[PDB]
Paper text:
[name] (for mini Singlet Oxygen Generator)1 is a 106 amino acid flavin-binding protein that generates 1O2 under exposure to blue light. It was originally developed by Shu and coworkers for correlative light and electron microscopy (CLEM) as it both fluoresces and catalyzes the photo-oxidation of diaminobenzidine (DAB), providing high-resolution images. Novel applications are being actively developed since. [name] was engineered from the LOV2 (Light, Oxygen and Voltage) domain of [name] phototropin 21. The absence of a structure of [name] so far had prevented to rationalize these observations, which we have attempted here using a combined structural and photophysical approach.
We have solved the structure of [name] at 1.17 Å resolution, which shows an increase in rigidity of the environment of the chromophore compared to that in the LOV2 domain, the location of potential quenchers of the excited states of FMN, and the phosphoribityl tail of FMN lying in a tunnel bridging the bulk solvent and the chromophore encased in the core of the protein. The latter hinders oxygen access to the isoalloxazine ring. 1 ΦΔ=ΦT×kO2kp+kPhot+kO2≈ΦT×kO2kp+kO2 Our structural results above suggest that the low value of kO2 is due to the steric hindrance of the ribityl tail within the tunnel which provides oxygen access to the FMN. Regarding kP, the [name] structure shows that six electron-rich residues are positioned within 8.2 to 10.2 Å from the isoalloxazine ring, namely Tyr30, Tyr73, Trp81, His85, Met89 and Tyr98, and are thus close enough to the chromophore to act as electron-transfer quenchers of 3miniSOG*20. In addition, four hydrophilic residues, Glu44, Asp72, Asp82 and Glu103, form hydrogen bonds with FMN, and may thus enhance protein quenching and O2•− formation. Oxygen only quenches 7% of the triplets, which limits Φ∆ to 0.6 × 0.07 = 0.042 (Eq. 1), in excellent agreement with the experimental value. It can therefore be concluded that the modest Φ∆ of [name] is due to an unfavorable combination of low kO2 and high kP values, as proposed previously.
Residue numbers in the entry: 1 to 115
The structure:
Amino acid sequence: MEKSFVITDPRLPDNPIIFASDGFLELTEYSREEILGRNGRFLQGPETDQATVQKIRDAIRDQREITVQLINYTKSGKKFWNLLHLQPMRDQKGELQYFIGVQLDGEFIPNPLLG
Ligand SMILES: Cc1cc2nc3c(=O)[nH]c(=O)nc-3n(C[C@H](O)[C@H](O)[C@H](O)COP(=O)(O)O)c2cc1C
Ligand SMILES: [Cl-]
Ligand SMILES: [Co+2]
Ligand SMILES: [Mg+2]
């Protein structure tokens, strides 16, 4: 599939998605109109590890890059493992401008060696 990514605007409330790639639409099964303006946490669900969610929270707060692997769900409820790479993007004035999150679908590291 084409690269799956979203870009969020941390200068707006709760870091909404302002761009979703065609690959993200394909991976998640959502349409662009179901995505724009919401927070990326919508892909989470019952099996998502909250310890991993906390790590993401801290990285966003600290404006630090992180990679985690966590369970996400398609629109039709199919579970997938998401190796999510989150990167802050700063402008030439040194100011945070965006986050980008790139999703790779797969259980890259076996679950027994995550937990
Ligand atoms: C650019 C960007 C992309 C994100 N992509 C995803 C994603 O693909 N899947 C996911 O579960 N969370 C994703 N998140 C994480 C959630 O948006 C959120 O930051 C996380 O769940 C921690 O915050 P919370 O505890 O308030 O939900 C993304 C965050 C950002 C900033
Ligand atoms: Cl966020
Ligand atoms: Co591909
Ligand atoms: Mg939550």
